[PDB]
């Protein structure tokens, strides 16, 4: 927790294993959850160039020995000495040291030898939705436009059966004419074909002068296209759904980016609201005749995999094009039916954007997520960087392999990278098209150390992270965070106290999600509970062949509950949800802070008791909390469902609350409203707030995630006698829940029994 407060990094093992055999013994992958941008109260922005080691590229860090008599510092990684250049020869005395040597996380504003490009935003706006859906899309776009920064530059493109690329901010000679370059659908023009036809083939050329311009110079031209935004006029053939080329629309947007701004801040914002019907990205036919793909369809490798694979090839081609150019892409998919997240996820995970997943635009999840995307920080600027390159500087002992999360490997193959790639690797640095204040990347490491006598005396095992992002003030930036973990001194056990239960739990979530992308769900589940059972067998106190002597430390005891809920959650089970819902889950899981992703693994069950008169207490997620006299608050990052009982609900009906003896009932009813809106306005994509009550409202969500209390298994345990006719015929009206899930109590029983015999 304090480790996340300082640098934003969270290792699974705070103390590391010694050797390769020690890495096999600890049995879990060493890894961390560095949040790159991560506004904490420890960064200091300074307008001088960083001092760089010629051998390693290391920036002077607080764990550097400074030879004051020779004006030389030593690099802690390469063990080579470097001098202090000129200005740092004086004022290097022991009382006056710079902020490089005092604070671990330091920020360098990169003095250039010019107004750097402010962020760009395309608005790939859909038209083939229902009228009230489109009207509120106009309203949200007007409010988003009012939340543009003054220097920010925008370009509208409204698509449908064919893309209309509207040019902005024309001459004052007309004022009464808007132009739109129309590209017909069902025709996959290449990248260079779009450049030549548009004719675009101090950072704005006259070819793009009809195109992208400041919002401070357009104004009326933006408000015009948003208010003559209307439907498509095509009579569809009988039962056909309105024809839509989403894949063409993204290619036209990305091709404008190519001849225009190459390595400059830009983000395409898709507002898709229906699946692609024709042209590229084909997921279902133009007519509403044959079924769209399902989770069942991917299970039994149906014929609709021809629309899964060949549409994946197109969207990964556009994903790689967006990566090599340097611009991120956003999805605001808000369709009532299936739209195609599992193809369009490869473009948002590689570049890094938003995967907001509304249903119909009036719902709360869309509206505030758009305005939270363009909100400002305490300094008033936009709280998101661009063109971030994150390179690691490992030490001699350990070597990096993977960066599972919102980034993409580039290269620079060398001695810092080892074999056995988990995730995406063969690289030291990771490109990221844009990175906000929520992105978290899982960096995996492995300790080689073939001989146990290679660690330096009291080795702190240095590791330096370097991110080169661009801030929307117009200033290129470089932030370095330098961290150390002492490890594996010969008094045995040290690696295990450094283990913390939540950090490694999210790490195995991201590894399970990447391995479901490659192979099927059965073998990754067999690998996952093998990782659990081999951990529990070594990392517990027991005697062999005696399960009654089982014991777990405070670090080691809550991890099986995250593993039970992880095997219970929708990331590994592709059933019970549509493929777009599962892809929505996996897309935000790879980019999530550890505290918020832990909530998404095991949902919170903040309980609101009447008789307690005080703060909430976290109860166990089970159905021994559905008593009718309480209120419930489930928090699973996607639903903030507030569950009433039948006793509280009928108090609301006949009105105990209105008559003034029940002021405590008013506080019991306003606490769910006020504390939930606190939850909604802090976290990204703002979850669907839904009122609930017992046996009604929309409580089918909460009764789904909540474990059954009176398991039918405990309703078959031996010993029926002498209670058949007693006691005035009534007890409390219990609720019964049926699900495939064995109880948390019995899942620990197989965990203990299998670990003890092994």
């Amino acid at each position: 927790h304090e480790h996340e407060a300082a640098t934003g990094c969270r290792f699974s093992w705070n103390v590391w294993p010694a050797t390769r055999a020690e890495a096999q013994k600890i049995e879990l992958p060493l890894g961390c959850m560095f949040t790159p941008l991560r506004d904490c109260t420890s960064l200091q922005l300074v307008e001088y160039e960083p001092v760089r080691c010629r051998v390693s590229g290391c920036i002077l860090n607080p764990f550097c020995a400074i030879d004051f008599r020779s004006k030389q510092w030593t690099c802690p990684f390469s063990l080579q000495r470097n001098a202090f250049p000129n200005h740092y020869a004086m004022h290097i005395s022991e009382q006056n040291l710079p902020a490089e040597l005092l604070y671990p996380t330091i920020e360098y504003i990169l003095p250039q030898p010019e107004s750097l490009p402010p962020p760009l935003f395309f608005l790939v706006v859909d038209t083939c939705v229902i009228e009230e859906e489109l009207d509120q899309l106009r309203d949200s776009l007007m409010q988003a436009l009012a939340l543009m920064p003054s220097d920010a530059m925008v370009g509208i493109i409204t698509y449908g059966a064919m893309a209309m690329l509207h040019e902005l901010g024309g001459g004052s000679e007309n004022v009464d004419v808007m132009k739109a370059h129309v590209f017909r659908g069902n025709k996959e023009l290449t990248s260079t074909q779009i450049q030549q036809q548009l004719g675009l083939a101090p950072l704005l050329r006259p070819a793009a002068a009809r195109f992208i311009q400041p919002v401070g110079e357009c104004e009326y031209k933006l408000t015009s296209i948003l208010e003559e935004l209307r439907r498509d006029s095509w009579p569809v053939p009988s039962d056909s759904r309105p024809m839509r080329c989403t894949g063409l629309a993204l290619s036209v947007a990305l091709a404008v980016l190519e001849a225009a701004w190459y390595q400059l801040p830009a983000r395409v914002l898709l507002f898709v609201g229906g699946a692609c019907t024709s042209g590229p990205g084909q997921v279902v036919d133009l007519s509403l005749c044959e079924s769209i793909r399902h989770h069942l369809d991917l299970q039994k490798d149906n014929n609709n995999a021809r629309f899964v694979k060949k549409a994946l090839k197109y969207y990964t081609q556009l994903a790689n094009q967006a990566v090599r150019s340097g611009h991120a892409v956003d999805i605001f998919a808000c369709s009532l039916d299936q739209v195609g997240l599992y193809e369009m996820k490869v473009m948002t995970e590689k570049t890094g954007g938003c995967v907001v997943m509304g249903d119909s635009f009036s719902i709360n999840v869309f509206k505030d997520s758009l305005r939270k995307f363009f909100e400002t920080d305490s300094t008033g600027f936009l709280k998101m960087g661009f063109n971030a390159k994150i390179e690691v500087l490992c030490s001699k002992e350990f070597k990096v392999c993977g960066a599972i999360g919102p980034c993409t490997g580039t290269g620079k193959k060398g001695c810092q990278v080892s074999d056995t790639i988990v995730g995406e690797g063969m690289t030291t640095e990771w490109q990221a098209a844009a990175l906000d204040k929520e992105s978290t990347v899982a960096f995996y490491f492995e300790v080689t150390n073939q001989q146990a006598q290679n660690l330096p005396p009291g080795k702190q095992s240095f590791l330096q992270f370097q991110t080169s992002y661009l801030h929307p003030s117009g200033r290129r930036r470089l932030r370095v965070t330098t961290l150390s973990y002492r490890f594996a001194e010969p008094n045995t056990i040290d690696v295990a106290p450094g283990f913390d239960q939540e950090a490694a739990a999210v790490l195995m979530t991201r590894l399970a999600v990447f391995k479901t992308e490659s192979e099927e769900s059965l073998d990754v589940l067999r690998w996952l509970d093998r990782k659990l059972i081999r951990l529990v067998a070594r990392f517990a106190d027991y005697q062999k062949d005696d399960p009654s002597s089982f014991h777990l430390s405070t670090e080691f005891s809550i991890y099986p509950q995250f593993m039970y809920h992880l095997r219970r959650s929708h990331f590994l089970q592709t059933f019970n949800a549509s493929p777009d819902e599962t892809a929505y889950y996996r897309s935000v899981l790879l980019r999530a802070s550890v505290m918020n992703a832990l909530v998404m693994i095991q949902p919170a069950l903040l309980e609101y008791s009447f008789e307690q008169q005080g703060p909430p207490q976290p109860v166990l997620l089970d159905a021994q909390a559905l008593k009718p006299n309480v209120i419930l608050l489930l928090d699973s990052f996607f639903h903030v469902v507030v569950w009433h009982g039948e006793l509280i609900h009928q108090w609301r009906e006949q009105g105990f609350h209105n008559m003034p003896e029940y002021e405590n009932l008013r506080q019991l009813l306003q606490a769910p409203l006020e504390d939930a809106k606190v939850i909604l306005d802090e976290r990204f994509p703002v979850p669907k707030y839904v009122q609930c009550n017992s046996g009604g409202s929309q409580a089918r969500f909460l009764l789904a995630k909540v474990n059954p209390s009176t398991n039918y298994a405990q309703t078959a345990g031996g010993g029926a006698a002498m209670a058949g006719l007693m006691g005035d015929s009534g007890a409390a009206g219990e609720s019964f829940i049926n699900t495939d899930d064995v109880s948390l109590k019995v899942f620990m029983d197989h965990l203990i029994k299998l670990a003890v015999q092994s």
């Binding site: 008094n491 045995t492 056990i493 040290d494 106190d541 062999k544 430390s553």
Partner: protein
């Protein structure tokens, strides 16, 4: 019963030698150099508390009229006159917070005594367990 125990009871020799003796040494040192840290931080505060009772002690009662201030004092008589019970409620209060500060550093440095026999002792449960249990697994082979 020479049944190839030689290579595997030898690694039980190695595990029992570099861990059973060395852990006992390395924690017997652990408390004695934090209780010699008790010696060093006790005596630093002996230094500043002795000097607070030599110049403040002598300055009162070496210079005429201020030594008359500790001649009248709070007077050695009854009838506390509603000024010298005003006063010494803060005298035992300053005695209270001085011993509160002393017990609270006592508590914090006794955490370093106690937060050392959980982890390393469980290691001695640990690395001798899979050696002994496997000494019944491979023993049931011939």
């Amino acid at each position: 019963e020479h049944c190839l125990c030689t290579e595997k009871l030898q690694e039980l020799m190695d595990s029992l030698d570099d861990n059973l003796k060395s852990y006992e040494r390395n924690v017997w040192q652990l408390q004695v150099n934090v209780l010699e840290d008790e010696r060093t931080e006790l005596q630093m505060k002996v230094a500043n508390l002795s000097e607070r009772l030599t110049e403040i002690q002598s300055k009162i009662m070496n210079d005429p009229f201020l030594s008359a201030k500790y001649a009248a004092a709070g007077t050695p008589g009854a009838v506390p006159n509603a000024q010298t019970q005003l006063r010494e409620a803060s005298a035992r209060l300053a005695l209270a917070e001085s011993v509160n500060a002393e017990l609270e550093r006592r508590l914090a440095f006794e955490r370093s005594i106690s937060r050392s026999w959980q982890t390393n002792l469980r290691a001695m449960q640990r690395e001798l367990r899979e050696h002994l249990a496997s000494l019944a697994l491979a023993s049931r082979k011939s």
